[PDB]
Each structure stands twice: as structure tokens, then as C-alpha cells.
């Protein structure tokens, strides 16, 4: 029973190394799998958060825009004037206007630090019959390009309204 | 010494109890994962039986409609001395062979009649030219309205 | 010593019972996850078949409509329905050109012609009596052989 016990001892030692190590290899995967599950869930939370952000920004922008159009529509009904666009070619920004007489206004910046607006009138689409309808209502000068300080602007506006 | 031994057997017995407790949770969780399947199985069973009736009922209505159609066709042919063999749809227009004078009719509304004598015994082909006009023996074209009228002309001559 | 032995004992006991439960639960549950799949496969099959069973019945029925629709354009005659009251089947009919409703019964073989005027504007009923032999309106009876002949007679008068 002496030799047999010794034989048993060696076998036990061999099996323990073989099954233990295999087990260690296995536990490592168990601990690791949980960790993998843990990081993925966190990643998922962030994505859902980022999605709300995008959805909420899309509603607030689509909601604020509605106001952009409404107001534009108000001013048209209340001031008989609509501002179509805006460009900024290097020096000066420009807006097309329709008040019917279409024209553009440009802004001067820098220099004596006071804004200067340049008026040119654009009849991109016109029928001569109107162009003479208009020359009868409008001082000849408005058509030619002009230049005044901002202070004078409102004054301008009024002159054109009165004549139309 | 027997001091430390006792402490071991006690620490080994503690964690073992904890392991058993952990084991119980697994079973308590299983029985649910299994009962929730025995309901999804049931929905499928209910759905499958429903889908089976549908197929069976469609098979009877189709086999029932087919019979009626056949009957009608037969009746017509008989008490009509005129039978419609087939139907093609080459691109533009469908065609039916008809049957004694065989011919075909095309539909593009407007109609087209063409004689069909691919095969005949000359003796008949002259039997036929004596009962019917030369124009029929040529392709023709009339509005649908005129069709029944056509039919009658051919019957009267035959 | 007796305690530590009853403790660990109970522990191992629960363990074995729990392990056995786990071995059994896990099988009773995997064998369901296969029956779920078979049901799923069958459903998908039934869906294809059903969908493909709706067009053949419908087109076929629809095709009959095409056939029904042809006959109506070509024979100035439409068969509304069909009953089978014990002895004999019956079909309503409407024949004529933009018309005389009647029914035909079938009971060797033999036929029965009755005229249906359940509803009419007298103005028509006299328009009709001027075009139609007085006799067609009253119920009649002839062998099948004579049918087509009948049919012609009514068409010619309308």
C-alpha cells in the first residue's frame, strides 16, 4: 500500500495541473466575458444618449425655422417688404429686397467705423410696361446706384413706400 | 493547531453554503426562462392552426370555383356551337383560337379576325367557300360593338 | 463534530439536488428551443403557400371574370347566378342589347324557360311585347338540343 499510495500521489499531481490550468484558462474567460458585456452596455448607453441629442436638435431647429418663415410672412404683411437672401463677398454683405421694386443693399464696414449702405435696384425680371409704370411713380434717381449713411436708411425706405 | 484546523473546516463550510445559495438563484431564474417559452410555443400553435384553416378554406373555394367555371364553359360551348380553345398575350394584344371554321381573334378597344386553315382537306375548304364569303377568308378589323354581329353572320352561314 | 457533519452534509445534499435540477431544467428547456424553431419554419412555409394561394384563386376567379366579361361583350348574354333546389338547377339570365330577364331550369335531360319581370317600367314591358313573340314570356319546355335555337330566336328579336 506504500507503493500504491505513491503512485496515486503522482497521478493526483498530474491531473490537478491539467484540470486546474484548464480551469484557470476557463475562469479567465468567465471574468473576461463579464467585462466584455460590461463595456458594450456602457457603449450602448452613450449611443442612445447621442441619439436623443440629435432628435432634440432636429425638433428645435425645425421649430425655430417655423418662426423664421412666420416672421418673414408678418413683415411682408406689415411692412410691404421682404428680404430674400444674404451674401458676404469679401468686403460687404448684401441683401436682395422686394418692396413692386426689387433692389439690393450693401453694407460698408471699417473706415470711419460707421456703416454705409449702397443702393442699386435690380429688375432681373421685368416687363417694359411695368418699367414705365414704375418710372412714373418713382423719382428717376432711385434706380441709379446711391450711397448714404445708415442713419438715413429708414428715411429712404419711407420715400419708396410713399411713392408705391 | 487543532485551533486552525477548526477554522478551516468552518471557512470551507461557509463558502460552500454560499455556493449552494448561488446555485438556488440559477434554478429560480430557469423556471421563468422556461415558462415564458411555453407561452410563445402556444401562440405559434394558435397561429399555425389558424394558418392551416386559411389554406384548407382557400383550397375548397378554389376547387369550388373551378368546377363552376368548367360547368359554365361546357354549357356555353354546347348551347353555342362555338368553343374557345386557348389564350396568349404576346406583348400587345391577347388572342383566342376559336372553333366548321377555325379562326383567331385578337384584342388590342378594337378587334381583329384572321382565318385559320393551317390544316384542311381541300374538299372542305371548297365546301366552306360555298357557304361563306371571300372577305371572311381575309383578316379584318372592327370595333368590339360589332362583334356579336359578326358571330351571328358566321352562324347563319354555317 | 456531529454539527459540522450535519452541516456539510445538508450542504452537499442541497448541492446534488440543485445540480440534478439544473441538469434536468437545462434539457427540458433546450428541447423547447427546438420545437419553437420547427413551429417557426412551418409558419414561414404556410405564409408563402397562402400568399401564392391567393393569386391563383383570384386570377382564376378574375380570369373567369375575363371569360365572363368576354361572353358579355360577345353574346349579349350574362348569367347572374345558380341554385339547386332539390330537383333541378337554375340560372338567372339577362340577354339583349343595352333587355329580357329570365331563368332556365334543368331537370334524358330537359329544360324550362320562364320570364322574369318581377320589376319593370310598363313602358318597357310594352316596348318588349312589340319586339317579342307573345309566347316567350309564358313558361315553356324543350329538350336541350333546342336550346341554342331558342337563344338565337331571342337575340334576333332584340
Amino acid at each position: 500500500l506504500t507503493v500504491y499510495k505513491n503512485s496515486v500521489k503522482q497521478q493526483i499531481d498530474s491531473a490537478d495541473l491539467l484540470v486546474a490550468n484548464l480551469v484557470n484558462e476557463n475562469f479567465v474567460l468567465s471574468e473576461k466575458l463579464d467585462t466584455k458585456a460590461t463595456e458594450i452596455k456602457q457603449l450602448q448607453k452613450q449611443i442612445d444618449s447621442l441619439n436623443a441629442q440629435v432628435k432634440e436638435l432636429k425638433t428645435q431647429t425645425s421649430q425655430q425655422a417655423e418662426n423664421s418663415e412666420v416672421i418673414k410672412d408678418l413683415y411682408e404683411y406689415l411692412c410691404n417688404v421682404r428680404v430674400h437672401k444674404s451674401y458676404e463677398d469679401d468686403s460687404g454683405l448684401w441683401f436682395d429686397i422686394s418692396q413692386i421694386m426689387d433692389y439690393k443693399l450693401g453694407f460698408v464696414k471699417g473706415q470711419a467705423q460707421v456703416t454705409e449702405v449702397i443702393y442699386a435696384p435690380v429688375l432681373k425680371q421685368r416687363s417694359t410696361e411695368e418699367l414705365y409704370s414704375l418710372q412714373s411713380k418713382l423719382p428717376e434717381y432711385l434706380f441709379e446706384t446711391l450711397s448714404f449713411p445708415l442713419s438715413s436708411l429708414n428715411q429712404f425706405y419711407n420715400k419708396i413706400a410713399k411713392s408705391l | 493547531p487543532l485551533t486552525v484546523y477548526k477554522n478551516s473546516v468552518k471557512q470551507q463550510i461557509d463558502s460552500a453554503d454560499l455556493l449552494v445559495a448561488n446555485l438556488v438563484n440559477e434554478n429560480f431564474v430557469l423556471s421563468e426562462k422556461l415558462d415564458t417559452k411555453a407561452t410563445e410555443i402556444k401562440q405559434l400553435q394558435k397561429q399555425i392552426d389558424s394558418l392551416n384553416a386559411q389554406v384548407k378554406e382557400l383550397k375548397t373555394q378554389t376547387s369550388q370555383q373551378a368546377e363552376n367555371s368548367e360547368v359554365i364553359k361546357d354549357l356555353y360551348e354546347y348551347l353555342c356551337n362555338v368553343r374557345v380553345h386557348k389564350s396568349y398575350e404576346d406583348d400587345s394584344g391577347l388572342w383566342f383560337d376559336i372553333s366548321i371554321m377555325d379562326y383567331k381573334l385578337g384584342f388590342v378597344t378594337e378587334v381583329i379576325y384572321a382565318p385559320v386553315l393551317k390544316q384542311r382537306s381541300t374538299e372542305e375548304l371548297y365546301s366552306l367557300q360555298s357557304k361563306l364569303p371571300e372577305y371572311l377568308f381575309e383578316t379584318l378589323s372592327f370595333p368590339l360593338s360589332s362583334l356579336n354581329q359578326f358571330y351571328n353572320k358566321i352562324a347563319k352561314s354555317l | 463534530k456531529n454539527s459540522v457533519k450535519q452541516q456539510i452534509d445538508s450542504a452537499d445534499l442541497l448541492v446534488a439536488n440543485l445540480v440534478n435540477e439544473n441538469f434536468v431544467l437545462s434539457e427540458k428547456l433546450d428541447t423547447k428551443a427546438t420545437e419553437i424553431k420547427q413551429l417557426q419554419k412551418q409558419i414561414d412555409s404556410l405564409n408563402a403557400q397562402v400568399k401564392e394561394l391567393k393569386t391563383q384563386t383570384s386570377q382564376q376567379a378574375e380570369n373567369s371574370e375575363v371569360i365572363k366579361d368576354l361572353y358579355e361583350y360577345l353574346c349579349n348574354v350574362r348569367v347572374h347566378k345558380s341554385y339547386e333546389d332539390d330537383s333541378g338547377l337554375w340560372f338567372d339570365i339577362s340577354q339583349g342589347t343595352h333587355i329580357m330577364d329570365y331563368k332556365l331550369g334543368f331537370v334524358v335531360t330537359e329544360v324550362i324557360y320562364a320570364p322574369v319581370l318581377k320589376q319593370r317600367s310598363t313602358e318597357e314591358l310594352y316596348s318588349l311585347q312589340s319586339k317579342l313573340p307573345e309566347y316567350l314570356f309564358e313558361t315553356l319546355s324543350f329538350p336541350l338540343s333546342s336550346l341554342n335555337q331558342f337563344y338565337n330566336k331571342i337575340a334576333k328579336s332584340l
Binding site: V23, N26, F27, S30 | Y5, S8, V9, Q11, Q12, I13, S15, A16, L18, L19, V20, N22, L23, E26 | I8, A11, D12, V15
Partner: peptide, 30 residues
């Protein structure tokens, strides 16, 4: 987890076995 738990439980049952075997070793030594 399960694995770890099982191991710890069996390992504990082993320690006891070892202690028992020792109790006899001391006796043999006597």
C-alpha cells in the same frame, strides 16, 4: 462564477479530508 463556487466548495471538503488523514498520521506517529 459557478465554476469558482464549485471549486471552492470541493476544495473545502478536501481540506477536511486532509485534516482527517492527518489526525491518523499523528496517531501512527504516536
Amino acid at each position: 462564477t459557478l465554476l469558482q463556487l464549485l471549486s471552492n466548495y470541493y476544495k473545502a471538503k478536501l481540506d477536511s479530508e486532509r485534516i482527517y488523514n492527518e489526525y491518523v498520521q499523528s496517531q501512527y506517529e504516536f
